[PDB]
C-alpha cells in the first residue's frame, strides 16, 4: 500500500537498512502494485522505522 | 474481471460420442490371426471411419468460478477511475429529456463529442424518466441501465459513461464500504449489527 514515488521509498529503505548489513539490501519495486519487496526478514525494524516517520 | 464476466457464465454444450456410445460394433470384425490384415476389436474404434471420437468435448461443461469480492469491487473502482482519467466520464444531473425523439439524443452526443456509444446509468429501474426510456429503447449504441447493473464489461464496451448524481452518491458508498469491512461471518443477506 505505497502511494507516491516508490523509488523514494526504495532509496530511504536501502539507506536505512545499509548500516545494518554493511551492504545495500537487494530489492524489488513494483510500481504498478504499489509495493516494495526486500530480501531477508526485516519486518520488525521496518515497522519501527515506518512508525518513526508517522505513517 | 472482464475475463471473469465473460467466462463464469459460460456453459458449453458440446458433446461427442466415445467409442462406447456409438451405435453398434460390439463384435470383432474378423479373426485375430491369418486374415492377413490389421487386427481390430469394434468397428466403432476411434481409428475407424464412423467410429467414436478419441477425446473430444464431453458433456455440458461449466466454466464457473468466482473472483474474490474485494477483487471485483476493485475492478469496478478501476473502471470508473479510468473512464474519468481519460475524460470520457460525465456526471449528469437529472436525466430529464426535453422530448422522446431519439434523434435529439444522437445529435446531443454529436454536439458534446461523446463518441459513438454511450452508457447511461440511472439509480433505480422504475424511477427512470419516460422520455429517456422512449428515446433509448429505439437506439442501439445508447444504453440505459440501472445502478445495480453497472459492470466492467459494459463500461469497456461503451466509449462514454454518463452517471446520474444520486447514482454517484450510491456507487461511492457501495464500493467504499469494502475497505473498512470485516470478512463475512455468515452471508451478508442475513442480519448484521450495522448492516442492512
Amino acid at each position: 500500500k505505497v502511494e507516491g514515488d516508490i523509488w523514494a521509498l526504495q532509496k530511504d529503505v536501502e539507506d536505512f537498512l545499509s548500516p545494518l548489513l554493511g551492504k545495500t539490501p537487494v530489492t524489488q519495486v513494483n510500481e504498478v502494485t504499489g509495493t516494495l519487496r526486500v530480501k531477508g526478514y526485516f519486518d520488525q525494524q521496518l515497522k519501527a522505522w515506518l512508525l518513526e516517520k508517522g505513517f | 474481471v472482464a475475463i471473469w464476466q465473460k467466462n463464469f457464465k459460460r456453459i458449453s454444450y458440446a458433446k461427442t460420442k466415445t467409442r462406447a456410445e456409438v451405435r453398434g460394433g460390439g463384435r470383432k470384425p474378423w479373426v485375430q490371426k491369418g486374415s492377413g490384415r490389421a487386427r481390430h476389436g469394434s468397428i466403432r474404434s476411434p481409428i475407424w471411419r464412423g467410429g467414436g471420437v478419441a477425446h473430444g468435448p464431453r458433456g455440458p461443461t461449466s466454466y464457473y468460478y468466482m473472483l474474490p469480492m474485494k477483487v471485483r469491487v476493485q475492478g469496478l473502482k478501476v473502471a470508473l477511475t479510468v473512464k474519468l482519467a481519460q475524460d470520457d466520464l460525465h456526471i449528469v444531473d437529472s436525466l430529464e429529456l426535453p422530448t422522446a425523439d431519439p434523434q435529439y439524443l444522437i445529435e446531443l452526443a454529436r454536439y458534446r463529442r461523446w463518441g459513438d456509444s454511450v452508457l447511461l446509468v440511472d439509480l433505480e429501474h422504475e424511477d427512470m424518466p419516460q422520455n429517456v426510456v422512449a428515446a433509448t429503447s429505439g437506439l442501439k449504441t445508447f444504453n440505459l441501465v440501472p445502478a445495480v447493473g453497472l459492470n466492467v464489461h459494459s463500461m469497456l464496451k461503451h466509449q462514454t459513461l454518463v452517471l446520474t448524481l444520486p447514482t454517484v452518491a450510491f456507487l461511492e458508498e457501495k464500493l467504499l464500504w469494502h475497505n473498512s469491512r470485516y470478512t463475512p461471518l455468515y452471508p451478508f443477506r442475513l442480519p448484521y449489527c450495522d448492516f442492512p
Binding site: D5, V32 | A2, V82, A85, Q86, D87, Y182, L185
Partner: protein
C-alpha cells in the same frame, strides 16, 4: 495522488480490444506436438510406465511396503473424541481491547470474541471452546469480565491483578455451535435449547474454585482467589467497591446459553419479539 493517472490522458481508450494479463500470470501449457514434445511425449519407453500402468502409490515393487512394515501404534487413536480448546493469549485479548473490537465494559464470553473475529471456533472439529493462555501476562493491563472454557493459573493471576474476574464455563457441542453463531440459529426457528452439563471426566475441573469453575462453590472463590495473590505477590483489589461491579458479578445459569435469555424461548427477529411458553410441562422441562 497516482501519477499513473496522468499518463492515461495521453494514451488511447482502455477498451476490450487492448487488455493484457499481468506477465507471468499465465504459464502457457504445452502439447505433445512437434519434434520436442512429440514422439514418446514425456512418457519414456515401453515398460509399465509408458503404457500408464505403474502400480498404486505405496507399492514398493513387491517388497513389504514401508508404510506397512512399521507397526501400528495408537497415535491418532481416538483422535476424533479428544477435546479441542482454541488458544487465546492475553496478548491477543489486549490487542483486541486496545483497538476496540471487544469492549471490556460489558461481559466478555465466547460470542463477544467471535464477533470481534479475535477467535474462530469450529465445533464440527470438536472444538469445545476457547482456552486462555498466558503469553501476554506481564503486558496485560486491561480490566475485564471474561468467560472461557479453560484457563491457566498464570492467565487468571494476570487478570485478577487488574481487578477483573475470570470464570470457566462448559458448553456441549450443540450449545457451543449455537453460542458462536447465534444469528444463524435464530433463523432456524427452534426454541433455545438447554445447556447440557459436562461429562464425567470434566466434572472435577468445573467443580473446583481453583479453576474458577462455573459449577464451583462460591464459598471457596474468595479463598482460592486470595491464594493466587500470595503466590504471585500482588495486592488483591476489592471488586465489591468498584463502579462496574454489577457487570463483573454477572453469571449465567449453568443451564443457560446466553445472557438474559432463557432456555425454551424463541426469537422472532422479523417482529423483533421474543416468545415464551406458558405451558407447565414445557416450563418444567426447560427450567430443569
Amino acid at each position: 495522488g497516482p501519477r499513473a493517472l496522468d499518463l492515461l490522458r495521453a494514451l488511447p481508450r482502455v477498451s476490450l480490444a487492448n487488455l493484457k494479463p499481468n506477465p507471468g500470470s499465465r504459464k502457457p501449457e504445452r502439447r505433445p506436438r512437434g519434434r520436442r514434445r512429440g514422439r514418446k511425449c514425456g512418457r519414456g519407453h515401453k515398460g509399465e510406465r509408458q503404457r500408464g500402468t505403474r502400480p498404486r502409490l505405496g507399492f514398493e515393487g513387491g517388497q513389504t511396503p514401508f508404510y506397512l512394515r512399521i507397526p501400528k501404534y495408537g497415535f491418532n487413536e481416538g483422535h476424533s473424541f479428544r477435546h479441542q480448546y482454541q488458544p487465546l493469549s492475553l496478548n491477543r485479548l489486549q490487542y483486541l481491547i486496545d483497538l476496540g473490537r471487544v469492549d471490556p465494559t460489558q461481559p466478555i464470553d465466547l460470542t463477544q470474541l467471535v464477533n470481534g473475529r479475535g477467535v474462530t471456533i469450529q465445533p464440527s472439529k470438536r472444538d469445545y471452546g476457547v482456552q486462555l493462555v498466558e503469553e501476554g501476562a506481564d503486558t496485560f493491563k486491561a480490566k475485564v469480565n471474561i468467560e472461557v472454557q479453560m484457563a491457566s493459573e498464570l492467565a487468571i493471576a494476570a487478570i485478577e491483578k487488574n481487578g477483573g474476574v475470570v470464570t470457566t464455563a462448559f458448553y456441549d457441542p450443540r450449545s457451543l455451535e449455537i453460542l458462536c453463531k447465534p444469528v444463524p440459529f435464530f433463523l432456524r426457528g427452534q426454541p433455545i435449547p438447554k445447556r447440557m452439563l459436562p461429562p464425567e471426566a470434566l466434572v472435577p475441573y468445573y467443580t473446583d474454585a481453583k479453576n474458577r469453575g462455573y459449577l464451583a462453590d462460591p464459598a471457596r472463590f474468595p479463598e482460592a482467589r486470595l491464594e493466587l495473590a500470595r503466590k504471585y505477590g500482588y495486592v488483591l483489589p476489592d471488586i465489591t467497591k468498584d463502579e462496574l461491579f454489577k457487570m463483573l458479578s454477572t453469571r449465567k445459569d449453568p443451564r443457560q446459553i446466553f445472557f438474559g435469555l432463557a432456555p425454551g424461548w424463541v426469537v422472532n427477529m422479523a417482529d423483533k419479539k421474543i416468545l415464551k411458553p406458558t405451558d407447565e410441562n414445557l416450563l418444567k422441562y426447560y427450567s430443569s
